C-alpha cells in the first residue's frame, strides 16, 4: 500500500534468485572466490557447503557455464551473460501480451505456412502446420487482420513464442 512499485520489484527478485540474507558479506556483494570453501546456513535444520570449481568460456549467444559442487556432488549451471549485448541475433520475440505479434506456444520446426503476407485471409482458418513429437498440431486463426511483413519464411528452427507473422 505504501510503496507498490518497489514492493512488486522486490517480490520478483527474491523469487527468480531465491531467498537471500542467509549468505556471508563476501557472497552477497562480492561473490564466491575460486578454490576456497565457504559455508551457507540455510535454515536451523540443515546446512550445506559449496566449492566453485571453474568458469567456462562463452559458447552460444552469450550463455557461459559455471561449475559448482554442492555438498557431496558436482553441479553445472548455465548463466546468461548480459555484458555483451552488442550482436544482433535477430530471432524476433513475439510477446503474448501484444496481440499483433504471433508466437509459437511450443518450440519446434515449421512444416508449412498457408498464408502469404499482405493478402486476404479468413477468420478462424488454418494458417500454419506444426510438427510435434508424435502428433500433428493445427493452428487456428485467432482474429481477422492484415500481416505487414514477414521476416522468417520457412525451413529454420524457432523456439517458443517467436515472431514469424505480425497481425493487424
Amino acid at each position: 500500500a505504501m510503496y507498490p512499485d518497489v514492493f512488486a520489484h522486490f517480490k520478483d527478485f527474491t523469487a527468480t534468485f531465491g531467498p537471500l540474507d542467509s549468505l556471508n558479506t563476501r557472497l552477497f556483494l562480492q561473490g564466491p572466490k575460486i578454490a576456497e570453501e565457504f559455508e551457507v546456513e540455510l535454515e536451523r535444520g540443515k546446512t550445506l557447503h559449496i566449492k566453485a570449481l571453474a568458469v567456462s568460456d562463452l559458447n552460444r549467444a552469450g550463455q557461459r557455464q559455471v561449475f559448482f559442487e554442492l555438498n557431496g556432488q558436482l553441479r553445472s549451471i548455465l548463466v546468461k551473460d548480459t555484458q555483451a549485448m552488442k550482436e544482433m541475433h535477430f530471432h524476433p520475440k513475439a510477446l503474448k501480451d501484444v496481440k499483433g505479434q504471433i508466437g509459437a506456444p511450443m518450440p519446434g520446426k515449421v512444416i508449412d505456412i498457408k498464408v502469404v503476407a499482405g493478402a486476404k485471409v479468413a477468420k478462424g482458418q488454418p494458417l500454419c502446420v506444426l510438427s510435434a513429437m508424435k502428433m500433428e498440431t493445427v493452428v487456428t486463426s485467432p482474429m481477422e487482420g492484415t500481416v505487414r511483413k514477414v521476416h522468417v519464411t520457412k525451413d529454420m528452427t524457432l523456439e517458443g513464442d517467436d515472431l514469424i507473422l505480425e497481425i493487424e
Binding site: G45, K46, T47, H49, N71, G72, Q73, L74
Partner: protein, 474 residues
C-alpha cells in the same frame, strides 16, 4: 498393550545402514535427525535426512561417533524420541543403552541387561551348557599356564585353536598341530595377546576339519513372542571375515534345519531376548552342530534373508519399539515362506592381489547395474567421491535375487560386469572368479575353500583405453 507413538528418530551411525533406516522411517512418516563428524562432511547419509548436526568437534575421527555425552546432549535438545544404534560402532556397548534409558530417550534393541549377559564369552559358554544346544569342547576358564595347554592337548586331541577373549581382532587365532609347534605357538600367542591388548584371556578349543557355520535370524517382541526368520550360509570365509553370503541352505537335511530352528528358539526364549537377534552355529561333516556365539544386533547380511521371506526387518524393529505385538502386525510362523534364492556380495576398495590391502583415492567414473532381480544399496558412490583412509572401505552393497542358485549366480555375474568403477582400485575380478568357479555352483563349500585354491586369483587385466586416452589428451 502399551503404545507410545514416536515422532522422530536419530541414527547414531554412518554409511548404508543410516540410509536404510532413513528410508524405513520416511516410509512411516517419521521425522529424521542425523549426526555427522567434521571429517565426514561430504557423505551422502547427512543429505537424505531432515536434520543434520555436527558432533565430536575436536575428537579423533574414528572415535567421534563414540562420545556418549555429546550424542545424549544433541538428542535431548532436539526433542528426539528414539535412537537406532545400527551396527559396528555402539551396538554392543551396554553403557550407551543405559545412558539412553536414563535421559528418557527410547533405545531400539534389547535391554542393557541382556546385552551385558551376551557380553563376554564365559557367560555365553555357561548359558549354552545350563539351558541350550551342545557346544564345541574347550576350556571354560582362560588359559595362562603351560601345564594347562599341555594337559588339555593330552586329554581331548592334538589339533587345538588359540582364541583371545576381551578382543574383537582376529590377531589372537593361531592353529596347533604338534607338540613342537604347540610350544612356540603358545609362546607367540600369549606374548601377542598380552602385548597388543590388555588381559590375555586365551582359550583352548579343538579345531574342526571342514567347518561350515549357519546363521539363524531371530526376531522377538516385548510379550514373549519369538519368530525366527530362517537360516543362512556364509561358508565363503577369506580367513575369518565374511565376503559372500547365500540365504537358502545349500545341502542341509530338513531335520537338521528344524533342529537348528528349535534350538535357536529355545535359546532365545530362555534368555528373554527383545529385538533383532542372530544365533551363530557350526556344523561338522558327520552332521553334528556346535554352538559358537550370539550376536545382539542386526547383522549386515540381514538384507539377504529380507528378500526370501519379503519381510521388512526395520519396520518390525520400529513397530516393536513402539510396543506393538507381532500378531497385530500379521507376522507368524505359518505366514512366512521361502521363495527363490539370493546372493550377497560387497564391493570393497581392497586389492585382492597383494594382501587385500585397502586402497584410497578418488572415484573418477561411476555407473550402476540395476536389472531384473538386482537390488542396490549405495552407501557412498558417486562421481568425484573420495574414499577415507581411516573409516571403513565399503563402496556398494549389491544383492542379486533369482529363482535358483545358478540363475542368481548368472544374474550377479552380469550385474557385476555392468558396474564400471575406474581409477579407484577394486576387487571385482576376484568376485567374478569366485562366481565362475564350478565348485561354487556345485553347492558344497567349506571354510578352507579359498585356502586350497591359489589359482582362484586369476587377476584379470583391462585394456582401459577409455581413461588412458583422456590422460594423454589432458
Amino acid at each position: 498393550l502399551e503404545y507410545k507413538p514416536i515422532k522422530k528418530v536419530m541414527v547414531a551411525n554412518r554409511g548404508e545402514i543410516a540410509i536404510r533406516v532413513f528410508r524405513a522411517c520416511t516410509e512411516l512418516g517419521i521425522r529424521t535427525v542425523a549426526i555427522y563428524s567434521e571429517q565426514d562432511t561430504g557423505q551422502m547419509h547427512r543429505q537424505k535426512a531432515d536434520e543434520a548436526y555436527l558432533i565430536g568437534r575436536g575428537l579423533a575421527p574414528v572415535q567421534a561417533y563414540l562420545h556418549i555425552p555429546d550424542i545424549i546432549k544433541v538428542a535431548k535438545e532436539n526433542n528426539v524420541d528414539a535412537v537406532h544404534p545400527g551396527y559396528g560402532f555402539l551396538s554392543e556397548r551396554a553403557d550407551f543403552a543405559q545412558a539412553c534409558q536414563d535421559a528418557g530417550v527410547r533405545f531400539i534393541g534389547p535391554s542393557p541387561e541382556v546385552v551385558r549377559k551376551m557380553g563376554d564369552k564365559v557367560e555365553a559358554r555357561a548359558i549354552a551348557i545350563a539351558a541350550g544346544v551342545p557346544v564345541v569342547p574347550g576350556t571354560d576358564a582362560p588359559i595362562t599356564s603351560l601345564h594347562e595347554a599341555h594337559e588339555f592337548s593330552n586329554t581331548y586331541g592334538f589339533p587345538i585353536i588359540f582364541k583371545a577373549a576381551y578382543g574383537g581382532g582376529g590377531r589372537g587365532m593361531r592353529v596347533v598341530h604338534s607338540y613342537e609347534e604347540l610350544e612356540e605357538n603358545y609362546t607367540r600367542a600369549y606374548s601377542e595377546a598380552l602385548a597388543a591388548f590388555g588381559n590375555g584371556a586365551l582359550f583352548v578349543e579343538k579345531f574342526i576339519e571342514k567347518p561350515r557355520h549357519i546363521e539363524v535370524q531371530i526376531l522377538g517382541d516385548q510379550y514373549g513372542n519369538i519368530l525366527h526368520l530362517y537360516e543362512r550360509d556364509c561358508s565363503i570365509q577369506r580367513r575369518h571375515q565374511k565376503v559372500v553370503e547365500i540365504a537358502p541352505a545349500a545341502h542341509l537335511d530338513p531335520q537338521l534345519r528344524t533342529r537348528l530352528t528349535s534350538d535357536s528358539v529355545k535359546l532365545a526364549k530362555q534368555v528373554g531376548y527383545e529385538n533383532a537377534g542372530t544365533v551363530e552355529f557350526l556344523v561338522d561333516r558327520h552332521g553334528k552342530h556346535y554352538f559358537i556365539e550370539v550376536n545382539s544386533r542386526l547383522q549386515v547380511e540381514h538384507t539377504v534373508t529380507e528378500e526370501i521371506t519379503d519381510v521388512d526387518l526395520v519396520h518390525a524393529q520400529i513397530h516393536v519399539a513402539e510396543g506393538r505385538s507381532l500378531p497385530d502386525l500379521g507376522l507368524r510362523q505359518e505366514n512366512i515362506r521361502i521363495n527363490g534364492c539370493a546372493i550377497q556380495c560387497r564391493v570393497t576398495t581392497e586389492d585382492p592381489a597383494r594382501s587385500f590391502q585397502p586402497d584410497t583415492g578418488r572415484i573418477e567414473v561411476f555407473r550402476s547395474g540395476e536389472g531384473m532381480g538386482i537390488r542396490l544399496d549405495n552407501a557412498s558412490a558417486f562421481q568425484g567421491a573420495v574414499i577415507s583412509p581411516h573409516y571403513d572401505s565399503l563402496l556398494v552393497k549389491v544383492i542379486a535375487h533369482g529363482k535358483d542358485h545358478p540363475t542368481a549366480a548368472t544374474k550377479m555375474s552380469r550385474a557385476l560386469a555392468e558396474f564400471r568403477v575406474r581409477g579407484v582400485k577394486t576387487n571385482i575380478a576376484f568376485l567374478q572368479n569366485v562366481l565362475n568357479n564350478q565348485q561354487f555352483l556345485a553347492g558344497t563349500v567349506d571354510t578352507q575353500f579359498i585356502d586350497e585354491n591359489p589359482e582362484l586369483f586369476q587377476l584379470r587385466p583391462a585394456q582401459n583405453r577409455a581413461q588412458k586416452l583422456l590422460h594423454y589428451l589432458g
